From Swiss-Prot, chain E:
Protein name: Small ribosomal subunit protein uS4
Family under the similarity heading: Belongs to the universal ribosomal protein uS4 family.
Lineage top rank: taxon: Eukaryota
Organism: Entamoeba histolytica (strain ATCC 30459 / HM-1:IMSS / ABRM)
Amino acid sequence: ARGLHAARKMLAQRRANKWADKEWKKGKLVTRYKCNPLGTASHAKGLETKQPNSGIRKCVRVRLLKNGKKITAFVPRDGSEVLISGFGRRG
Amino acid sequence: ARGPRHHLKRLNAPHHWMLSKLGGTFAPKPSHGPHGMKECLPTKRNTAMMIGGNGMGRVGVIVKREVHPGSFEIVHIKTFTTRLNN
Amino acid sequence: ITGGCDKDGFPMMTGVATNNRVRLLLDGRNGCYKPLRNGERRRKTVRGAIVAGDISVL
Amino acid sequence: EQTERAYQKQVFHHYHKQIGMGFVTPAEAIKGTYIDKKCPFTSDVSIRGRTLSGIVKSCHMKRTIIVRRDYFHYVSKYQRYEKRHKNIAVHCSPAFRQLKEGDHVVIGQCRPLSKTVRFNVLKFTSRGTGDKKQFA
Amino acid sequence: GRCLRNHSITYKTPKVPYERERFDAELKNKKHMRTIAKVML
Amino acid sequence: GITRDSRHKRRATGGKKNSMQKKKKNTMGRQPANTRVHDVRCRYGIIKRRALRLENGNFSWVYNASDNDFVNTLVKGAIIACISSRPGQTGSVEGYIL
RNA sequence: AUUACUUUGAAUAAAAUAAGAAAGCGAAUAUUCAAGCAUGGGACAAUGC
RNA sequence: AAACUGCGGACGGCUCAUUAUAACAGUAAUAGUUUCUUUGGUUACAAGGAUAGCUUUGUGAAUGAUAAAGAUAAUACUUGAGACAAUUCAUUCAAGUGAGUUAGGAUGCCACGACAAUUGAGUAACCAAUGAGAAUUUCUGAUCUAUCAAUCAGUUGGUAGUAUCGAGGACUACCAAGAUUAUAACGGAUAACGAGGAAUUGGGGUUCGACAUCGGAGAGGGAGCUUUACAGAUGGCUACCACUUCUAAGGAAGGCAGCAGGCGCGUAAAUUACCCACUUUCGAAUUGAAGAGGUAGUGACGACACAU
């Protein structure tokens, strides 16, 4: 629709098509409060690589105080209650 | 509000009182009497005088007075327009 | 009788006709309570006008 | 009209007044025998500031009809309008008898007369017949 | 809002962090009306 | 007790309103003291003469239009002559000869 | 014939925005839309006649 | 000084749990209501008694604990006269306003009934303003959702009463079958108080707004009330639910989402400071009081200038 009086559809059309947006939908439906281990928070106090790279990544498993779920966390540096704050990529 | 208000805020005070915005948190509340809170003080805002709208502070003489039975009536003065109460 | 206090300090009433501590929504019209504001009623406890051994002094 | 438990009577008993800004009292109001306490012309109810219009959607209610208003709502983002409607219940005095569904009526705002009724019919214009001659 | 007193920023960092043609030209430290002209033109 | 606001009624479409506050004193209702004379301290300090029961009445020159059950409560428009005052409000019965 | 549209006005809390070292204090200071009121116009439109 | 009496504590301050056409913003009405304060106007040389502080007896551990007795005043409470004002009702004459059997006059009735029996200024009733104000209400405007499509029975209207400061199903009795919905009704979700605004933007827009100011709502949860001019008040009361505290073990109080401050929570947030000197408010008033407010303390949240 393009006519001057068809403002109902295009407003309605856009609302439907927004749900296809992966980034936009993730921030509106209820998973940031039940599926995100961090919830909406920044940090969280708590208690082998892919094919072409060889070695061992030292890691840690942590149980969160609030939720209680267990997550795997990396150790920062070489030879390196715990505060955990994500990675470069969001989620 | 449970009852009539007594205090007055600096920001909420009428504009033409020329009160600053940092002098003090409160402004003096005008007591009830012969003149209203916004029509008193406790062109910078027959021949007539404008006391109301944009024409406040203007003197001049009326040309004609349209009347609309619905809402109000308009006064035109030597030319600017405004309601009767001004 | 003109009045008196109980062994626990509570006064004895005059209208009340019992012998046990009775909790009443008292007011200033019968002495045993002095209002702080105006028109304030407190459910104080008092004792009946009939004398007893609990009356610490008459 | 005395078909109820009380002796119905007028408001100023000794009557017809006239509404204000450029209106005409209908003929049926004076000669009509109807007793209406909420009639604008033969009672103590007046017409204040607001004044609307519309078409009549329903004429089933006793001494009351439903006016439909259609307008537009400009929406900023798309620079376009959308059709919208609003229905308001208007009290209609028996001074209008030919009034039927689909007619165009000028209404005025009066005091609260019911939970929903707050307006009074002032001047009506009939339209073409919508196959059902439904009147008050 | 949070405070009645006004405030402002007196500078703006560049969009591109590293560009040689800007490092030399700019080289104590490295810390309006054109559009106003524009709007009336 | 008795409130007179429209926060507990439904909408014209049948919707159920949702509570956002509590009962406020400006919507006070009062128990209807049927006139088969007290005074009530209304708002702003004015007084309402609440006639509990009364038999005499001034008049100027057996049936209740609203509720037959009332037939000997005294209300406006009641036939006894037709009462024209509001006895429960004014505190006296004033009527006219039919 | 109304309405839409359009032009002007009226009327329009301050703070803030922009405007007549960050600040501070009398700007014509202009807003600030969605409605609503008055007005000149009737080309493009919708509603019945 | 105290006490009686009077006024205020219904403003101020905090918070955002509620709440989805509800509240809120703008606009319109109140010919449908209206006080408090303030301002303008009108309408018997003095009478009668009791009461606190006062004194006396006490009581229990004690609350902002209360009991007895004997006095003494009022601008406390009354009666009482110098002589009207406004309410209800029935009838009638009738000029502003866009518009009124309207303000108003007249007739008869009821109701109420003065200008302190005041003090070195004080008081009653009514009219008007303050009042664009308070409160109700007119029109337009809100986020996501159909894995919410049919919804409502005081429901929608009519009559007559009641109740209300007052309109109105606000409520009661009788009568009718009506109201809304695909132009999204009804219902669901929010980590939803709304607006003025903020962040970012070429134009267009997207996201945020508990939080300076305006309006709303709340004081652990409901509910019911008192006093008054204003409260469904909670730094007022009453009862239940859930807690907190003192106890001589008989009993007793309390409501930090005021200012500081402690815990718990969490990634995440300051002094158990001083003073009414600014601004303002309340008071029997130029004085008193104010964790409102100002000053000082902590304070790489941020902003401006600026050493090396």
